[PDB]
Amino acid sequence: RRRTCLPAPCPSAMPVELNEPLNTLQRLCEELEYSELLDKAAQIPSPIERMVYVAAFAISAYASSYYRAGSKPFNPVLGETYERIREDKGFQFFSEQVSHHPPISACHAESRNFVFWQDVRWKNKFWGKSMEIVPIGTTHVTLPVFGDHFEWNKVTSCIHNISGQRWIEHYGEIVIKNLHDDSCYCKVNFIKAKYWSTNAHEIEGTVFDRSGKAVHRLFGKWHESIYCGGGSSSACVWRANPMPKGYEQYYSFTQFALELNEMDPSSKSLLPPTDTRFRPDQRFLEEGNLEEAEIQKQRIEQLQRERRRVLEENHVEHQPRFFRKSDDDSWVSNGTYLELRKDLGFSKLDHPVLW
Template identity: 45%
Template sequence: MEFQPLGTVNVRLPRYEDHYRWNKVTTCVHNLFGGQRWVDQYGDLIITNNKGIRCKLNFAKASYWSSNRYEVVGSVTDPDGKLVHHLFGKWCEGLYCGVAPSARCVWRPGALPEDHEHYYGFSRFAIELNDLELSLVDVLPSTDSRFRPDQRLLEEGNVPGAEASKLQLEQAQRERRITNEQRGIKHQPRWFRCTASDSVADEDGEKWEFAHTYWDARAQSKFRDMNLIRLW
């Protein structure tokens, strides 16, 4: 099964007046329905900077007869197109800058928690994404995914309960979509806005930006007064 993300990711660092933009490569899950499952990522990932710096990384596509599985090679160039850095490594092990054997490691994935096998092989970051502190229960909007029951049941190891809850949520979503279509209601995102994109990488000519209203609403406890959709 292949996942081909569209559009670009944008990150702005106001303190340094930097704006980074990059695309995502293709992710493929092999042996989804049988055998040993494994994940591959391949394609070109291009990172650009508003100051003219450019990085291109090629994620090699794995094959049964090649030895370059998980390999990444690339380069960083300055505004004049001159090579500044050479990059290589494996996306599941680490990325190095320079030429072997004197290259230095610039990135390495974090170590998995000791109990990661009990949490579906998740990293510490992935595990904590669903963490819900008691102090946040009355602060977050009801649509926050940390309130999603099937997700909580799966984390607690109740797989049958999670599957049943997931089916109920999906059915409710389908019914809600049909009702809205019949009434001519179009969903309007509350916390993001769609604007015209100046990047040729955005094929539909659009990009989504944070509307900068969420944190104000949260600080002023406005969620209870909003007509939020009941998702779960």
């Protein structure tokens, strides 16, 4: 039912040839590739075993990045949105680029079993021949059935040898807490690789009780599989979905990623006009038309600049449509996107014209 190809193979201010045809909002949606971990967490009465699956969920967010070091996602323009209603996975995702200077992406997804949301700001920085990626923002998951509210941070990424001998790495510590239950917390270390070994991508984690005693260990590789151990017992709690055959020909997308930008002709009229699916530069890139992709990308950046200039001449601050700024200065859904969609009410908002 959903596509498993693009019209054209991937090519063998940034030139479009370096882009993949997804943007930052869509990469947020990719963090729900393994949302079945939350469905399973919502069925585990014990908060300590449940924390294991949330941790695996947090780790699973990194898997897809393994094959994608060669490509850069599009920067959404200010006011761009992206939705993703997945009956199959039982969630409704939507997102919005709420700031461009600096770039901030916000997202929110509802399921009968969980609510997932975050806002993220990425700081890039080139260091010699390599690029350091430093995210700011917190990820949240609630599991209503238990009153759980988990929160955790992202770690640092590095893209090395920025040649075809390039590779991405993640390292740092994730700390996961449940704000409604201090009975346990979790710390996960993404181990930085060593020059003497090919062995990389390793994860070492522990679920601690409130006193700091170790109850479960977590270990494995963030692009492969993760195991849980807990006194004489051990189990695989997660593994990566296999890449589709010939996946390299389409930006090395997972099957999930390949589905994200697809325009479904039956549900098209349900979308607000800021949805990424309408963005023409990404669509030309999918079609292998690099020249027109580049023209459209430059044009879209120009439109964004002119719009920003007008706003500051009129002393007007940009106002996101589906997210509001909390006291945290974090961005959260204002509870209107899915309600307006359902009610066919997108016309009732004044949408910036982005392309």
